[PDB]
């Protein structure tokens, strides 16, 4: 069994669309995957053309041709994710593939980074051998790429070496897998969906145990940069007001992360991180060109929280809530800069915004 390379011979939208139909009729694409490709093509095309980019036609055809080639390759021979997955960069550079694919969807012109200088401080801690965990919200299946693209110029180390805790659809759906192959990951089934199919819960636990043992081993070696969203899912708009805010954190996931970092025999840090990009690829399909925001702020002192609270349970919830409140402060600044149309004027004493592209 060899890989079919027909999508690479495509030279137009018509040939690209016919190639989907031709591969489907030849039985090489299940109907759901063929439909998802059509949807992906149309939505991506519209978003890039809608953006006004002078090179939209070329960009769409190029990026979609490669994407469809790589998706088909995964349908033919599905990648299996190791507990810890290192980004594949050779012989096909899946990291660059994913960067290039998402780049045209971000309106850099209206995108913002909060507290850039702190990402440099994060690099200096990693240079010292410390471990750093970014405690973040999560908005789209493309978060890792969006994070990486916003920091690619100023902090390429972070952009390429961050290890994302991720799992579920992005590691299973062939439309998403080629993107994930190009990222460093710790593969974990979310608590959120753990019970969706009860017959599979034990299998998921066992897999999460392997991944978490591997993550602890990595932390023992030091210099790890890990991203995790303790809400365990993507943010959703308020059902009443329609307003988007970071989803509440699972305080136990936070506490587990803090404990691992404390018991790694290596100095570690948890920083609150906010990301704003739901418009680009929103959760329940839809793709749009839009500005994005990323911000980090200083670590919360667990000691101070422990010193001002009355018992263990209250301390754990207060610590998670302090991280959440920082993420939400930062997220509000990004929101104010972007949908609030304030740009850099949204800056506050806690969040200094910049556009370093």
UniProtKB/Swiss-Prot annotation:
One of its GO terms (cellular component) is chloroplast stroma. It comes from Cucurbita moschata (Winter crookneck squash). This is Glycerol-3-phosphate acyltransferase ATS12, chloroplastic. GO terms for molecular function: glycerol-3-phosphate O-acyltransferase activity. The HXXXXD motif is essential for acyltransferase activity and may constitute the binding site for the phosphate moiety of the glycerol-3-phosphate. Belongs to the GPAT/DAPAT family. It catalyses: a fatty acyl-[ACP] + sn-glycerol 3-phosphate = a 1-acyl-sn-glycero-3-phosphate + holo-[ACP]; sn-glycerol 3-phosphate + an acyl-CoA = a 1-acyl-sn-glycero-3-phosphate + CoA. Signal peptide: none annotated. The keyword Glycosyltransferase does not apply. One of its GO terms (biological process) is CDP-diacylglycerol biosynthetic process.
């Amino acid at each position: 069994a060899s890989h079919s390379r027909k999508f690479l011979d495509v030279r137009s939208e018509e040939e690209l669309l016919s190639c989907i139909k031709k591969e489907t009729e030849a039985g090489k694409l299940p109907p759901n995957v063929a439909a998802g490709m059509e949807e992906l093509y149309q939505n991506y095309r519209n978003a890039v053309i809608e953006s006004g980019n002078p090179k939209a036609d070329e960009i769409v055809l190029s990026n979609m041709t490669v994407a469809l080639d790589r998706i088909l390759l995964d349908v033919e021979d599905p990648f299996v994710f190791s507990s810890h997955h290192k980004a594949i960069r050779e012989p096909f550079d899946y990291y660059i593939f994913g960067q290039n694919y998402i780049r045209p969807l971000i309106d850099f012109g209206n995108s913002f980074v909060g507290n850039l200088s702190l990402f440099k401080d994060i690099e200096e801690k990693l240079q010292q051998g410390h471990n750093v965990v970014l405690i973040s919200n999560h908005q789209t299946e493309a978060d890792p790429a969006i994070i990486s693209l916003l920091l690619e110029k100023t902090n390429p180390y972070i952009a390429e070496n961050t290890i994302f805790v991720a799992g579920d659809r992005v590691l299973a759906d062939p439309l998403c897998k080629p993107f994930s192959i190009g990222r460093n990951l710790i593969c974990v089934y979310s608590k959120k969906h753990m019970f969706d199919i009860p017959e599979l819960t034990e299998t998921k636990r066992k897999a999460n145990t392997r991944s978490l043992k591997e993550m602890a081993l990595l932390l023992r070696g030091g210099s790890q940069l890990i991203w995790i969203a303790p809400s365990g899912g993507r943010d959703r708009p308020d059902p009443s007001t329609g307003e988007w805010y970071p989803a509440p954190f699972d305080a136990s996931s936070v506490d587990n992360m803090r404990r691992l970092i404390q018991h790694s025999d290596v100095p570690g840090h948890l920083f609150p991180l906010a990301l704003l990009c739901h418009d680009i690829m929103p959760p329940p399909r839809v793709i749009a060109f839009n500005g994005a925001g990323l911000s980090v702020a200083p670590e919360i002192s667990f000691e101070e929280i422990a010193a001002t609270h009355k018992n263990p349970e209250e301390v754990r919830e207060a610590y998670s809530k302090a991280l959440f409140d920082s993420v939400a402060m930062q997220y509000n600044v990004l929101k104010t800069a972007i949908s609030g149309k304030q740009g850099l004027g949204a800056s506050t004493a806690d969040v200094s915004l910049s556009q370093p592209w």
